[PDB]
Amino acid sequence: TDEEPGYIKKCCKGFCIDILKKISKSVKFTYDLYLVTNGKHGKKINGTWNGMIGEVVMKRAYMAVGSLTINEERSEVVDFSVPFIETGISVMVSRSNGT
Amino acid sequence: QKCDLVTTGELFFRSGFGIGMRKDSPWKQNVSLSILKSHENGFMEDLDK
Amino acid sequence: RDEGCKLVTIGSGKVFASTGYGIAIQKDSGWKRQVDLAILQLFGDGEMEE
Amino acid sequence: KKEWNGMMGELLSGQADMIVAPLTINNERAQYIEFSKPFKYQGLTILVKK
Numbered sequence: 016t017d018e019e020p021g022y023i024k025k026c027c028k029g030f031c032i033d034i035l036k037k038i039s040k041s042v043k044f045t046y047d048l049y050l051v052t053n054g055k056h057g058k059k060i061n062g063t064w065n066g067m068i069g070e071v072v073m074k075r076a077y078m079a080v081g082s083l084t085i086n087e088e089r090s091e092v093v094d095f096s097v098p099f100i101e102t103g104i105s106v107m108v109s110r111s112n113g114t
Numbered sequence: 115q116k117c118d119l120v121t122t123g124e125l126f127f128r129s130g131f132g133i134g135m136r137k138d139s140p141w142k143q144n145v146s147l148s149i150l151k152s153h154e155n156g157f158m159e160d161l162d163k
Numbered sequence: 164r165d166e167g168c169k170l171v172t173i174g175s176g177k178v179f180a181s182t183g184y185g186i187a188i189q190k191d192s193g194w195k196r197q198v199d200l201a202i203l204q205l206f207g208d209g210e211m212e213e
Numbered sequence: 214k215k216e217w218n219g220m221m222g223e224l225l226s227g228q229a230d231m232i233v234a235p236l237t238i239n240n241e242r243a244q245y246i247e248f249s250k251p252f253k254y255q256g257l258t259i260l261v262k263k
């Protein structure tokens with residue numbers, strides 16, 4: 016941990032990055048974008064948050080991007096904007112041939 | 115209901131409804147919290163049924 | 164993105180326990196309003212669907 | 214003069230307090246109102262006689 020926490024410059028490509036680029040263009044704000052070592056969207060670990068919620072609560076990162084749901088537990092410590100895509104618990108089926 | 119009128123077209127303008135209310139009135143956060151709670155526990159499913 | 168699209172979804176989006184994916188902001192920052200209006204604008208303009 | 218009518222027209226005047234109705238979230242309305250978290254997701258479609 017004494018040496019530099021690895022700053023591997025990678026390139027990012029996805030839907031949420033495009034959302035971020037569009038909102039940045041519309042609002043004219045730049046961003047130091049980085050990824051968290053937790054690897055989770057965030058759950059209450061003994062009253063402590065991690066990942067997106069952990070970084071936002073401790074304010075090391077101002078905002079969190081990605082596929083983040085909106086639930087009442089998360090809204091306790093952070094606030095969510097109007098959701099842009101619709102998700103939830105859904106059913107996946109195999110196709111059936113004709114009869 | 116009627117079964118002689120049929121819907122068509124892929125869902126464009128994918129959005130959501132919402133109860134709109136004045137900016138300065140304070141129920142907003144509590145209203146949103148209650149709506150999310152109703153979504154979580156299936157009360158909205160009971161309404162849909 | 165199935166290798167043959169041999170499976171299907173449900174109701175074309177008639178979902179149980181419906182929810183949304185969104186952005187996470189600090190507690191009651193001044194940015195929340197601006198990003199809300201920006202996202203609603205991009206919805207209205209129609210870039211999202213494509 | 215950019216005047217409003219309808220539910221929002223009577224709300225910005227303060228006659229009412231909360232619109233409980235299938236009101237669609239978008240940018241133009243959100244300027245002069247605020248919207249709770251969406252309680253029913255939906256899209257736009259067409260009817261034709263079968």
Ligand SMILES: *[C@@H]1O[C@H](CO)[C@@H](O[C@@H]2O[C@H](CO)[C@@H](O[C@H]3O[C@H](CO)[C@@H](O)[C@H](O)[C@@H]3O)[C@H](O)[C@H]2NC(C)=O)[C@H](O)[C@H]1NC(C)=O
Pocket residue numbers: 140141144
């Ligand atoms: C939104 O919901 C909130 C629920 O947490 C609510 O906060 C709670 O408000 C009650 C009463 O307003 C507080 O109870 C207090 O009751 C007496 C007299 O009011 C006090 O002497 C007590 O000490 C006690 O604090 C809750 O403490 C309070 N809880 C929290 C977490 O804030 C808001 O009032 C609601 N706001 C709106 C606009 O609906």
Ligand SMILES: *[C@@H]1O[C@H](CO)[C@@H](O)[C@H](O)[C@H]1NC(C)=O
Pocket residue numbers: 112
């Ligand atoms: C269903 O139809 C497809 C059409 O090519 C066929 O390949 C498949 O074998 C059929 N299912 C079964 C169980 O035979």
